A paper describes a structure:
The major histocompatibility complex (MHC), also known as the human leukocyte antigen ([name]) system in humans, plays a pivotal role in activating T-cell immune responses by presenting antigen peptides on antigen-presenting cells (APCs). [name]-A*30:01 and [name]-A*30:03 differ from one another only by five amino acids, three of which are located in the PBG. In this study, we determined the peptide presentation features of [name]-A*30:01 and [name]-A*30:03 through a series of structural and functional investigations. To explore the structural basis of the different peptide-binding characteristics of [name]-A*30:01 and [name]-A*30:03, we determined the structures of [name]-A*30:01/RT313, [name]-A*30:03/RT313, [name]-A*30:03/NP44, and [name]-A*30:03/[name] at 1.5, 2, 1.4, and 1.6 Å, respectively.
In contrast, [name] could be presented by [name]-A*30:03. Here, our results indicate that [name] bind to [name]-A*30:03, but not to [name]-A*30:01. In addition to binding peptides through PΩ-Lys, as do other A3 supertype members such as [name]-A*30:01 and [name]-A*11:01, [name]-A*30:03 could also bind peptides with hydrophobic residues as PΩ anchors. The PΩ residues of [name] (Met) and NP44 (Tyr) could also form stable hydrogen bonds with the residues in the F pocket of [name]-A*30:03. We found that [name]-A*30:03 could present [name]-M9Y, [name]-M9F, [name]-M9I, [name]-M9V, and [name]-M9L peptides with A1 supertype binding motifs and could also present the [name]-M9K peptide with A3 supertype binding motifs. However, it could not present [name]-M9R. In contrast to the typical A3 supertype alleles, [name]-A*30:03 could not present [name] when the PΩ residue was mutated to an Arg. The positive charge of Arg was too strong for it to insert into the F pocket of [name]-A*30:03. The strength of the negative charge of the [name]-A*30:03 F pocket was between that of the A3 supertype and A1 supertype alleles. This allowed the F pocket of [name]-A*30:03 to accommodate both the basic amino acids preferred by the A3 supertype and the aromatic and large hydrophobic amino acids preferred by the A1 supertype.
Residue numbers in the entry:
A (entry chain C): 1 to 9
B (entry chain A): 1 to 274
C (entry chain B): 1 to 99
The structure:
Amino acid sequence: QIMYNYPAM
Amino acid sequence: GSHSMRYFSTSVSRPGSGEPRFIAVGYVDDTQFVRFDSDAASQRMEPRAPWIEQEGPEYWDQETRNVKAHSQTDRENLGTLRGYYNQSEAGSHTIQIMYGCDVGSDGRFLRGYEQHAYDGKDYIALNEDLRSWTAADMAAQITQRKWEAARRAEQLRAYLEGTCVEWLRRYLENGKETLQRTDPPKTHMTHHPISDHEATLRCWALGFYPAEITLTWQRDGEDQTQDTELVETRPAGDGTFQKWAAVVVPSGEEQRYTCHVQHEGLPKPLTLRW
Amino acid sequence: IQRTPKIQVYSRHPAENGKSNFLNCYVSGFHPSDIEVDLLKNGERIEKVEHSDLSFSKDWSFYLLYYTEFTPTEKDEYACRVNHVTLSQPKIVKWDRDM
């Protein structure tokens, strides 16, 4: 299962 | 029998009117099980191993929803990094991410990972302690400070030690018939005269899983590395892997040169000669 | 920074004239990701060629497997053709049943 969100850089 | 889960994604900007191409894949050990391609017609996360198709619409709805959000975040991050680096809109640039977890044979957390690259070079990564970051340059330290203020390491550590481990356990059980198999290499030697004084020996390993393998040559009992060639381990296309190792030897002296094969599917390493 | 593809062309199973098999071109180590990969039969592109989903190695370089079903024969010559921004002309590697 993938992570919920990717981070803003 | 430790195991891993890894997710990979690549976002590539397409200068002009277009949106970026986003491709994500997931793997359990050396076996791919999901993909997403923003260019594809489905706009859904798709199965790529038989043992994941049993998950219900709720599994697929959430994966699709979150992978689309991931693509949109990377689209925004391509613009952010372009700004940090004072880059034009005219060029194509690439953001890559790898993340996931390792577990032991008891299914308990061993290690977690999250690494980011820009244009094929390190940008920022989570350290082994899952509590600190390594930034490659000052741009990446702008990102680092944002993630420090947001307590991202703690939130990401919860995913890597929690969700990632538990779902890896679920996949390993649902796919145990194939994921918890070891296929030992089938080995053979080939031989090619080159000249009145030289010959090539090539040691083959075929049909093995997982992909990790070691091929080494010994001349009269010590490791032989001069005049050797080792190809990258390569997929056979059926879920197994292949590798070969070659050495150039004086013609007629092939009996001196032994290939040694180490693989986790072998009770003991194999040795072979022409 | 750009990285030139590495190429291996090979069959799935040991080749036997007249027996069905798969022909593989594995190309790795390249950056950026846009690439052209084809399998050739007697110098002509094979139409029904599939490929794996883009992924990458620890050093961030990309890899892909391109593959097709084929039945090797005495008279048929196979090759893999790769084009990439790093290449001044397409690279053509001939299939050698012992490589």
